[PDB]
Enzyme design. Sequence first.
Site, PDB file in Angstrom:
ATOM      1  N   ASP A  81      -5.822  -7.832  -1.283  1.00  0.00           N
ATOM      2  CA  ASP A  81      -4.508  -7.877  -1.924  1.00  0.00           C
ATOM      3  C   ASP A  81      -4.184  -6.558  -2.641  1.00  0.00           C
ATOM      4  O   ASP A  81      -3.032  -6.101  -2.634  1.00  0.00           O
ATOM      5  CB  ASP A  81      -4.444  -9.035  -2.949  1.00  0.00           C
ATOM      6  CG  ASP A  81      -3.895 -10.353  -2.388  1.00  0.00           C
ATOM      7  OD1 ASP A  81      -3.769 -10.535  -1.165  1.00  0.00           O
ATOM      8  OD2 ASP A  81      -3.600 -11.269  -3.222  1.00  0.00           O
ATOM      9  N   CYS A 120       3.131  -4.657   9.054  1.00  0.00           N
ATOM     10  CA  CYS A 120       2.551  -5.210   7.830  1.00  0.00           C
ATOM     11  C   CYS A 120       3.727  -5.814   7.067  1.00  0.00           C
ATOM     12  O   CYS A 120       4.565  -6.495   7.694  1.00  0.00           O
ATOM     13  CB  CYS A 120       1.750  -4.141   7.116  1.00  0.00           C
ATOM     14  SG  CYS A 120       2.522  -2.477   6.894  1.00  0.00           S
ATOM     15  N   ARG A 126      -0.320   0.051   5.719  1.00  0.00           N
ATOM     16  CA  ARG A 126      -1.387  -0.368   6.639  1.00  0.00           C
ATOM     17  C   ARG A 126      -1.044  -0.053   8.093  1.00  0.00           C
ATOM     18  O   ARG A 126      -1.919   0.357   8.881  1.00  0.00           O
ATOM     19  CB  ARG A 126      -1.683  -1.878   6.488  1.00  0.00           C
ATOM     20  CG  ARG A 126      -2.062  -2.289   5.084  1.00  0.00           C
ATOM     21  CD  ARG A 126      -2.174  -3.814   4.948  1.00  0.00           C
ATOM     22  NE  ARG A 126      -2.231  -4.166   3.544  1.00  0.00           N
ATOM     23  CZ  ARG A 126      -2.177  -5.413   3.102  1.00  0.00           C
ATOM     24  NH1 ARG A 126      -2.113  -6.425   3.939  1.00  0.00           N
ATOM     25  NH2 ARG A 126      -2.170  -5.644   1.788  1.00  0.00           N
ATOM     26  N   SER A 127       0.227  -0.255   8.478  1.00  0.00           N
ATOM     27  CA  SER A 127       0.638   0.038   9.863  1.00  0.00           C
ATOM     28  C   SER A 127       0.447   1.509  10.202  1.00  0.00           C
ATOM     29  O   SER A 127       0.024   1.854  11.328  1.00  0.00           O
ATOM     30  CB  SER A 127       2.101  -0.346  10.077  1.00  0.00           C
ATOM     31  OG  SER A 127       2.346  -1.756  10.084  1.00  0.00           O
ATOM     32  N   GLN A 132       1.077   5.036   2.315  1.00  0.00           N
ATOM     33  CA  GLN A 132       1.840   4.782   1.082  1.00  0.00           C
ATOM     34  C   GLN A 132       1.156   5.238  -0.207  1.00  0.00           C
ATOM     35  O   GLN A 132       1.825   5.295  -1.264  1.00  0.00           O
ATOM     36  CB  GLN A 132       2.110   3.272   0.959  1.00  0.00           C
ATOM     37  CG  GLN A 132       3.296   2.769   1.723  1.00  0.00           C
ATOM     38  CD  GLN A 132       3.483   1.237   1.622  1.00  0.00           C
ATOM     39  OE1 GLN A 132       2.658   0.457   2.109  1.00  0.00           O
ATOM     40  NE2 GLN A 132       4.544   0.819   0.959  1.00  0.00           N
TER      41      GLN A 132
END
Length: 284
Positions: free
Chosen positions: A181, A215, A221-222, A262
């Site tokens: 998370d 994502c 994450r992508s 990110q």
Amino acid sequence: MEMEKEFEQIDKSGSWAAIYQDIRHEASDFPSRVAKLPKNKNRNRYRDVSPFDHSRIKLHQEDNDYINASLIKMEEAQRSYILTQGPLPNTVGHFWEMVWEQKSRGVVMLNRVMEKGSLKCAQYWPQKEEKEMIFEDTNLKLTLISEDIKSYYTVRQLELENLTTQETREILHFHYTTWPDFGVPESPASFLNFLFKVRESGSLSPEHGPVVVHCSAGIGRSGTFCLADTCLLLMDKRKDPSSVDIKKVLLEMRKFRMGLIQTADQLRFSYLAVIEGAKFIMGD
């Protein structure tokens, strides 16, 4: 510069935040006028994440052709990817329309439906064989065929039917279920194992349309997934694998979608994944 030595240099000096901000400063800025039209506000999950006009995927309908999705075309590596947001309640039909129209074989999902107590994307595939889903706005039917649940990921076989023509196609759903998370994984071992399972399926290969990867926003994450895949392929193809420059590859991919990677922690994790994955590409 061998990225492994670059890595230790950055790590010992603790300058990851400085490296990452350099990337943010040099990244491309292109218009995203279609994403910002008022008729499209309920088609975007986040106000600050939009596809560029020049690389956006267009839906094949005269009504409104907009979806929050971008074509990342890597010319030297000879790979293409579609990066998109997690589907919204109002865009699940658009999402499967895109998979159909672009002739994709695989969908790669890097988030859970609920994270941090909040919804990160719609439940957009069926959970039981006998309870299929019908998307009436785009005239598609989706059925769960089989499910294989493993410790770090789940693979599903799905049937997508174009109700207009009664053609059917098999779509493979690759769901990485264990990204934490907060933060990034401690070891890239399970993420690399997942990448190799997607590769083995054919879903990344030129006989199919581009893989669809997402994502929640379709950039963090992508971005890690496609950056690691392309860097490892380039190390396979070139005479000198130490010539592959991960920062330069990332800036090339940011010509096609804003914001990929990110955080500075995601950048470090991408380096770690490529360094460890190369200890199979060069032979190991």
